[PDB]
Design an enzyme around this catalytic site. Structure first.
Site, mmCIF file in Angstrom:
data_model
loop_
_atom_site.group_PDB
_atom_site.id
_atom_site.type_symbol
_atom_site.label_atom_id
_atom_site.label_comp_id
_atom_site.label_asym_id
_atom_site.label_seq_id
_atom_site.Cartn_x
_atom_site.Cartn_y
_atom_site.Cartn_z
ATOM 1 N N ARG A 87 4.285 -47.843 -5.476
ATOM 2 C CA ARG A 87 4.296 -48.899 -4.427
ATOM 3 C C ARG A 87 2.849 -49.198 -4.011
ATOM 4 N NH1 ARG A 87 8.537 -48.954 0.636
ATOM 5 N NH2 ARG A 87 7.249 -50.087 2.152
ATOM 6 N N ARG A 107 14.057 -58.082 -0.486
ATOM 7 C CA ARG A 107 14.684 -56.957 -1.225
ATOM 8 C C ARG A 107 16.071 -57.406 -1.698
ATOM 9 N NH1 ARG A 107 12.562 -51.599 2.144
ATOM 10 N NH2 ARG A 107 10.331 -52.082 1.952
ATOM 11 N N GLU A 115 4.774 -44.813 -1.884
ATOM 12 C CA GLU A 115 5.930 -44.229 -2.604
ATOM 13 C C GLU A 115 5.683 -44.375 -4.102
ATOM 14 O OE1 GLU A 115 8.942 -46.610 -0.833
ATOM 15 O OE2 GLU A 115 9.215 -45.252 0.876
HETATM 16 C C1 LIG Z 1 7.894 -43.381 7.539
HETATM 17 C C2 LIG Z 1 8.461 -43.330 6.157
HETATM 18 O O1 LIG Z 1 8.040 -42.553 5.310
HETATM 19 N N1 LIG Z 1 9.486 -44.151 5.929
HETATM 20 C C3 LIG Z 1 9.576 -45.042 4.779
HETATM 21 C C4 LIG Z 1 8.763 -46.309 5.067
HETATM 22 C C5 LIG Z 1 7.262 -46.092 4.901
HETATM 23 O O2 LIG Z 1 6.716 -46.161 6.221
HETATM 24 C C6 LIG Z 1 6.410 -47.025 4.006
HETATM 25 O O3 LIG Z 1 6.614 -46.716 2.625
HETATM 26 C C7 LIG Z 1 4.923 -46.924 4.298
HETATM 27 O O4 LIG Z 1 4.229 -48.138 4.015
HETATM 28 O O5 LIG Z 1 9.233 -47.368 4.216
HETATM 29 C C8 LIG Z 1 10.507 -47.840 4.695
HETATM 30 O O6 LIG Z 1 10.425 -48.385 6.022
HETATM 31 C C9 LIG Z 1 9.561 -49.523 6.260
HETATM 32 C C10 LIG Z 1 10.301 -50.854 6.219
HETATM 33 O O7 LIG Z 1 11.408 -50.855 7.124
HETATM 34 C C11 LIG Z 1 9.335 -51.998 6.583
HETATM 35 C C12 LIG Z 1 9.994 -53.361 6.682
HETATM 36 O O8 LIG Z 1 11.014 -53.543 5.700
HETATM 37 O O9 LIG Z 1 8.732 -51.720 7.877
HETATM 38 C C13 LIG Z 1 7.995 -50.506 7.892
HETATM 39 O O10 LIG Z 1 7.419 -50.332 9.156
HETATM 40 C C14 LIG Z 1 6.240 -51.129 9.443
HETATM 41 C C15 LIG Z 1 6.459 -51.758 10.814
HETATM 42 O O11 LIG Z 1 5.227 -52.287 11.315
HETATM 43 C C16 LIG Z 1 7.047 -50.776 11.836
HETATM 44 O O12 LIG Z 1 6.673 -51.193 13.143
HETATM 45 C C17 LIG Z 1 8.574 -50.656 11.729
HETATM 46 O O13 LIG Z 1 9.103 -49.585 11.812
HETATM 47 C C18 LIG Z 1 4.980 -50.251 9.358
HETATM 48 O O14 LIG Z 1 3.816 -51.075 9.457
HETATM 49 C C19 LIG Z 1 4.884 -49.430 8.085
HETATM 50 O O15 LIG Z 1 4.739 -50.254 6.929
HETATM 51 C C20 LIG Z 1 8.920 -49.326 7.619
HETATM 52 O O16 LIG Z 1 8.204 -48.094 7.661
HETATM 53 C C21 LIG Z 1 10.930 -49.018 3.805
HETATM 54 O O17 LIG Z 1 10.083 -49.627 3.191
HETATM 55 O O18 LIG Z 1 12.084 -49.377 3.767
HETATM 56 C C22 LIG Z 1 11.550 -46.710 4.773
HETATM 57 C C23 LIG Z 1 11.046 -45.306 4.439
HETATM 58 O O19 LIG Z 1 11.839 -44.363 5.165
#
Ligand SMILES: CC(=O)N[C@@H]1[C@@H]([C@H](O)[C@H](O)CO)O[C@@](O[C@H]2[C@@H](O)[C@@H](CO)O[C@@H](O[C@@H]([C@H](O)[C@@H](O)C=O)[C@H](O)CO)[C@@H]2O)(C(=O)O)C[C@@H]1O
Ligand SMILES: CC(=O)N[C@@H]1[C@@H]([C@H](O)[C@H](O)CO)O[C@@](O[C@H]2[C@@H](O)[C@@H](CO)O[C@@H](O[C@@H]([C@H](O)[C@@H](O)C=O)[C@H](O)CO)[C@@H]2O)(C(=O)O)C[C@@H]1O
Lengths: 519, 519
Positions: B390, B454, B374
């Protein structure tokens, strides 16, 4: 031209709009392939008059990384969504066809162009609300047509499906969840089911939790609106969230038909778990309190709570509480509730608490076994109590015997061998030879029949006082994931009732013929 | 013994019933102690006429295992409970007193007998719904009376409290959650805030997600009902749960006032995360689609979606999408949206996508930096783009410069040093000297100001084009836990607007004077 069908062994709820009858995976579709029609056949002896509707849904495709052996991309009918537990989530499933008059042969159609690779369809069955709980469907997908060529069908789909009723769904009466089932049959044949009403969420004490009760005078076809058997609201001006009472156990005094409910009242403790936060002492401010209510009108109304902590709790114990589920009346009129205590060194022990005086006074003697928690007790032979225990070692139930109300304990032959578990509550009851159609003493047991997770909820029967549990004397009720707790009660001479946390509802009732269990 | 007070730097929401003004810990209470009276004092220049009510609550005690340094046992006012995000959960807090006419001195009373040890009380402020977003309270607890003896007060409680507005609360319009804020100011001074409408839960694509839009013509005092800027419902007969569109970015074409919204449409993918499940190719069935809508009526109505994928996506990329938040118009009329792509080896890269023809065609050149996601872009000097990224390496923001729309990239002096982060979306905007009250070029940045979790959402200002971020030129808005994403837009010459995921609402708007940021 290769299609996979699953007939999942999960309860068909008579009070639901949708129930999963068939899940279907078409793994190797060409973009634009159309499932023109599929034909369903019901067994010749099935009561199709109780079947209200059959629907064909499309649920799209699978994620590239989730492999090719799944029968769905997601839960089709939620048991947790407070806004809808009764119909398919419309965002996961689009209706293709629907039949509202059901014959022994049935055809469902689509015009949906399939995507390349994995495509998911599923069949919903809706039952009439007055459907017999003892009704069974034997259904098979006999034909699948793709591009006007019949396709090769594969998969285990020979399951004999059973009915159930969702007594409590997530969100009912504004409560986030319901947990920890107990079930008894009163002398009037009335079914009484108790449970935690967990208002805020699904976490254990300490929280805003009351003991709820569901009552049925027609063998579980109908359940009277939820009664609050026990509550502490804003006692001493502390929030209701710091006045929870739960993990209920219920027994019927078979001499008087007086119904008793014991539960753990936690007072204070911030918003943390009682299991690690209840501390030594005796006062409500110091430690969890052992509290009891009674009903002398067959479970219609409930006494104010009596505090029995001082009678039975050693001050050095961090935590004394009932074993969730049910207690018993013995042949000699002794009332017995299974109990568990955490000693001064945080080691949990299962035992029993009993009354000789219709529940006027209670006594606890010696623990049955180290590092045990939840237990249920049955009178397996005259004056002989079998305690069946959740064991923190994992893999299998602990089983001990007392002939002196737990002054002394003997290991049973079935100890840590005969009954697999994943460390979860289990139900055990005794049935006298003269009280059931088989005309033989029975033990009946229910739990998640696995060493990992909580699934394959199964009723098991023993003819030899719990020495042996023959595979043949077992009925699988729920092969999918749930919170796992269950409680058994004989409904009448011919049928056992199970009140359990299932994949299809927080509190699920099913009735099973003994003749299905035994030969 | 002493009493501890905290004045938490979190937004006071003008649209809420309850807001935490003070949390109070009485750590060493004797059973029966009574907080007779508590006196609050407000600064002489405070607008107490827009304070509707002040309440004193009791929240009981703490768990034995949770230590003695907490200011609460639980979240008092939920930002997640779909049934209530606007008032204190009554199961955690019991009202003791309430004052509906607020003077510079204020006394709240209780009769509540305290438990032995830790006891929690807290002060709620309710504001008039028409309260100015620029209003500030300077409040301190000056006296606490226990057993008619004044107690010694301790704790940092000198915060200058700021107002905000919950534009979207969990549960609003039947949506489980709202995530991923974008904010622009139109040429008519209209605020446009975009976000994911996450209907089923709060998990990212793939799910049932639409792009929502909130519109304000009065600098955020009032927000028009939610519009659906972008949606794919049951496209191609696939469920809405497999037709999600989200992570929106919004820009105003400053030449035409045409408003553009770009978002990622995921088609299929079962119920799994697009981040790991979007695969190489170009078709909606193969890969996530880059989709755009526009508004020519100042954000009142929205065009049907146009598919931009073929123009800018390399077929070998697993995933191309916008950087969430906002894009820009450059001085020379170029429209620029930050973008991110996952290459054939699953390595993410941040870059920029631009139009020279008012959004008719879009172009992407070279990625700025390896293992970035991002990003937001600002024109720091004429023809000079600053990308703020990011970074999956952790600890700090990546900062690069292009003067050829990302054909080539240079590391900025502030790269991986000047701006701490926890790996989270951040907002960056430029403000021209002639467009603001300070009369100097500004960069404004917002993110969670921490390397872990956060929290501590902070606006930072730079007077030297992002070389330096002086501690004095910073405003802390939210010190408590949230999902962390934010977006900045200048409201007028004097005030910056922030649309962010906060501890107090899924979509929170606050306005801040530039003269608060700079001296
Ligand atoms: C798909 C997309 O574009 N969504 C965005 C997402 C992006 O994936 C990241 O920028 C890429 O690195 O960022 C946000 O969601 C994140 C957050 O929730 C984070 C924990 O706080 O977990 C993350 O998911 C993990 C975990 O393993 C997964 O199993 C859970 O879902 C995975 O490895 C990806 O990093 C989860 O994607 C965020 O930062 O808030 C919300 C945003 O919509
Ligand atoms: C009064 C009481 O505690 N209630 C009962 C609880 C008992 O603790 C066990 O019978 C004894 O061990 O069992 C149940 O809940 C269990 C289960 O969920 C289990 C596994 O998920 O976790 C457990 O709590 C854990 C976890 O880590 C904690 O994070 C959860 O809160 C902690 O560390 C200590 O055990 C969690 O208490 C259950 O089996 O279903 C619910 C039952 O009411």
């Amino acid at each position: 031209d290769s299609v996979y069908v699953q007939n999942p062994q999960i309860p068909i709820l008579v009070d639901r709009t949708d129930n999963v009858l068939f899940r279907i995976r078409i793994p190797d579709a060409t973009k634009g392939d159309v499932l023109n029609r599929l034909t369903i056949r019901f067994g010749n002896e099935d009561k199709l008059s109780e079947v209200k509707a059959v629907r064909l849904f499309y649920a799209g495709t699978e994620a590239a990384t989730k492999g090719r052996s799944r029968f769905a991309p997601v839960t089709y009918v939620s048991s947790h969504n407070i806004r809808n537990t009764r119909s398919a989530n419309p965002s996961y499933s689009i209706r293709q066809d629907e039949v509202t008059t059901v014959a022994n042969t049935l055809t469902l159609k689509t015009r949906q162009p399939m995507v390349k690779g994995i495509n998911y369809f599923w069949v919903s069955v809706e039952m009439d609300r007055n459907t017999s709980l003892l009704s069974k469907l034997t259904s098979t997908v006999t034909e699948v047509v793709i591009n006007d060529k019949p396709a090769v069908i594969a998969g285990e789909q020979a399951a004999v499906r059973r009915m159930g009723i969702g007594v409590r769904h997530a969100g009912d009466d504004g409560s986030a969840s319901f947990r920890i089932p107990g079930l008894v049959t009163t002398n009037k044949g009335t079914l009484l089911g108790v449970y935690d009403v967990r208002y805020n969420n699904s976490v254990a004490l300490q929280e805003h939790i009351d003991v709820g009760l569901s009552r049925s005078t027609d063998k579980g076809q109908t359940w009277e609106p939820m009664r609050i058997a026990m509550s502490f609201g804003e006692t001493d001006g502390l929030p209701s969230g710091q006045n929870g009472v739960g993990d209920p156990s219920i027994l019927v005094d078979e001499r008087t038909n007086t119904v008793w409910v014991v539960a753990a009242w936690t007072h204070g403790m911030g918003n943390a778990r009682a299991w690690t936060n209840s501390m030594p002492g005796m006062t409500p401010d110091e430690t969890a309190q052992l509290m009891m209510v009674k009903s002398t009108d067959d479970g219609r109304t409930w006494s104010e709570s009596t505090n029995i902590t001082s009678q039975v709790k050693d001050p050095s114990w961090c935590f004394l509480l009932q074993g969730p589920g049910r207690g018993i009346t013995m042949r000699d009129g002794t009332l017995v509730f299974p109990i568990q205590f955490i000693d001064s060194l945080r080691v949990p022990h299962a035992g029993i608490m009993y009354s000789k005086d219709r529940g006027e006074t209670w006594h606890i003697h010696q623990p049955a076994r180290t590092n045990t928690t939840e237990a249920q007790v049955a009178e397996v032979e005259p004056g002989v109590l079998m305690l069946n225990m959740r064991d923190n070692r994992g893999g299998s139930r602990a089983v001990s015997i007392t002939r002196d109300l737990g002054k002394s304990w003997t290991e049973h032959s079935s100890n840590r061998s005969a009954l697999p578990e994943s460390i979860c509550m289990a139900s055990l009851i005794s049935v006298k030879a003269k009280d059931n159609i088989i005309g033989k003493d029975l033990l009946l047991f229910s739990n998640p029949n696995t060493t990992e997770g909580r699934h394959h909820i199964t009723i098991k029967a023993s003819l030899d006082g719990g020495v042996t549990w023959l595979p043949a004397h077992q009925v699988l009720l729920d092969e999918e994931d749930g919170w796992g707790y269950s409680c058994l009660s004989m409904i009448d001479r011919e049928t056992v009732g199970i009140f359990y946390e299932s994949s299809v509802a927080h509190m699920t009732f099913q009735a099973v013929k003994i003749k299905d269990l035994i030969r």
